[PDB]
Amino acid sequence: GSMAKAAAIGIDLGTTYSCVGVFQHGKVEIIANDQGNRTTPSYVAFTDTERLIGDAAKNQVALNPQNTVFDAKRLIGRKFGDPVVQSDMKHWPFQVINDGDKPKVQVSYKGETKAFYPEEISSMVLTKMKEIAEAYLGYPVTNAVITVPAYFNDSQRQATKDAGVIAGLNVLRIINEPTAAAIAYGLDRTGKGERNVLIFDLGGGTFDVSILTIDDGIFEVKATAGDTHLGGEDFDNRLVNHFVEEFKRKHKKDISQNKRAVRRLRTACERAKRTLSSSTQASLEIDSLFEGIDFYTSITRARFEELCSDLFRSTLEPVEKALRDAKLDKAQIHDLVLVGGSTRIPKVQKLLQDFFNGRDLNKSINPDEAVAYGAAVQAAILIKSTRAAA
Ligand SMILES: Nc1ncnc2c1nc(Br)n2[C@@H]1O[C@H](CO)[C@@H](O)[C@H]1O
Numbered sequence: 452g453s454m455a456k457a458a459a460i461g462i463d464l465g466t467t468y469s470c471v472g473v474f475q476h477g478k479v480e481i482i483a484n485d486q487g488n489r490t491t492p493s494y495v496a497f498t499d500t501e502r503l504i505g506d507a508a509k510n511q512v513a514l515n516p517q518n519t520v521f522d523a524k525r526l527i528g529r530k531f532g533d534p535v536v537q538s539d540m541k542h543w544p545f546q547v548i549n550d551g552d553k554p555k556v557q558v559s560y561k562g563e564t565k566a567f568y569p570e571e572i573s574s575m576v577l578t579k580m581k582e583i584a585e586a587y588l589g590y591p592v593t594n595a596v597i598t599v600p601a602y603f604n605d606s607q608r609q610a611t612k613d614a615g616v617i618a619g620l621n622v623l624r625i626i627n628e629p630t631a632a633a634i635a636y637g638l639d640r641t642g643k644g645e646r647n648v649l650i651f652d653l654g655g656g657t658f659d660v661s662i663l664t665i666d667d668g669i670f671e672v673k674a675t676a677g678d679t680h681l682g683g684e685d686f687d688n689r690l691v692n693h694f695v696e697e698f699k700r701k702h703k704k705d706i707s708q709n710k711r712a713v714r715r716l717r718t719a720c721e722r723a724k725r726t727l728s729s730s731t732q733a734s735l736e737i738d739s740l741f742e743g744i745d746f747y748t749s750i751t752r753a754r755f756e757e758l759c760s761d762l763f764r765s766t767l768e769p770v771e772k773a774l775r776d777a778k779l780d781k782a783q784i785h786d787l788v789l790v791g792g793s794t795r796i797p798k799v800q801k802l803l804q805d806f807f808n809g810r811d812l813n814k815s816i817n818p819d820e821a822v823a824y825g826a827a828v829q830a831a832i833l834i835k836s837t838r839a840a841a
Pocket residue numbers: 467468654655656682683684721724725726728791792793794795796819
C-alpha cells in the first residue's frame with residue numbers, strides 16, 4: 452500500500468556549533484555524533500589528503516589555521532564589501548577573497564588552491580549533520596528543517612537553502628532560531644490568547660535577544676536586539692589574561708608569546724569555565740606550561756564572576772532595548788527562554804531572573820540543543836499528509 456516514511460530532521464546550523472534532532476515516539480532525540488558529542492563544531496578542514504568536518508576539523512586547528520574554516524555563517528548571503536565582512540576578516544587566519552563582490556574562502560586542498568562560497572562550506576557541515584542522523588536512524592534521510600537568526604534577510608535565507616540543496620537535503624522550511632526555541636517548549640501549543648516570549652541567546656561570540664508574540668500558534672517577531680561583541684569567548688579571554696598575570700606574579704615569567712602555552716591555557720580556561728557552572732571552584736592543572744614549569748592552580752566561581760562582571764551585566768542592555776522596541780514592560784513577558792551554552796552560567800541566570808523580578812527561566816531543554824529540538828518538532832509536523840475522515 453504505502454511504505455513507511457523516513458523521519459525528517461531538525462538542524463540548528465550554528466555559527467560555532469551545529470545540532471541535529473529527530474521527533475519520533477512523541478519525543479525529540481538530539482543525536483550524538485560518533486565521538487559522543489550532542490553538538491558538532493561548524494568547522495571544515497582541508498589537507499593534502501582529506502576534507503575533515505566537525506570534531507576532526509576543530510581538533511587539528513592549532514597547526515593548520517590557514518586551511519581550517521569556521522564562522523562561514525558570518526559570510527553567508529553577504530557581499531564582500533559588507534562592512535561586517537571587512538571587520539570579521541581581520542580575526543580569521545584563513546583567506547577570504549573577492550569574487551564579483553561575493554566572499555569565498557580560499558585554502559590549500561589535495562595539492563591545489565581551492566576557493567569555496569560560504570554556502571558550500573555550510574553544505575559540508577550539513578552533510579555531516581545528515582550523516583550523524585543517518586547513523587542513528589539506520590536509513591537515508593531526505594527532509595530537513597534548517598534554522599537561521601531572525602535578523603537574516605532574503606539573500607541569507609536563500610543561501611542557507613542553497614547549502615541544504617548542495618548537501619542533498621530537501622529543505623522543508625527555513626525557520627527562525629528564536630521561533631524554534633519557543634516551539635521546543637510548546638509555547639505555540641498553549642491555545643487562544645497572546646503570549647509574549649523573550650529568547651535570551653548567549654553564544655560563543657554573539658548575543659541575541661528576541662521578543663515574539665504567539666497568538667493561536669502564529670508567531671510574530673516583535674523586536675530583536677543584541678551585542679555582536681559579547682559571547683563565551685570573551686569570558687575565556689578574561690580568564691586567560693588573569694592566569695597570564697598569575698604566572699607572572701608566581702614564576703616571574705611572561706608566557707604570552709608562546710602560542711602553544713597561551714592555547715593550552717585558553718583550552719584549560721574554557722573547561723574550568725564549564726566546571727564553574729556546576730561547582731563553586733575549579734582546579735587548573737597544566738604540565739610544563741612554559742620553560743618546564745607545571746602550572747597547578749585554582750579559581751573560585753566568585754573570582755571568575757568578578758573577572759567577567761561587566762560583561763555579564765551588559766546582557767541586560769539589549770533586553771531593555773528589545774522591550775522598548777516591542778513597547779512592552781518586563782511584567783508583560785509571559786515566558787523567558789534560554790539558548791546557548793553560555794546561559795548555563797549561574798550568574799548570567801541570576802542577573803536575568805533578578806531583572807524579571809524572580810521569574811522562572813525555561814532552561815530544562817539543554818540551551819545548546821533547544822533550537823535543533825524545535826526544528827525537529829516542526830520537521831515532523833511539516834511532513835504529515837493526513838487525509839480527513841468523512
Ligand atoms: N556549562 C557551560 N558553562 C558555561 N559556558 C558553557 C557551558 N557549555 C558550553 Br557549550 N559553554 C560555552 O558556550 C559557548 C558555545 O560556543 C562556548 O563559549 C562554550 O564555552
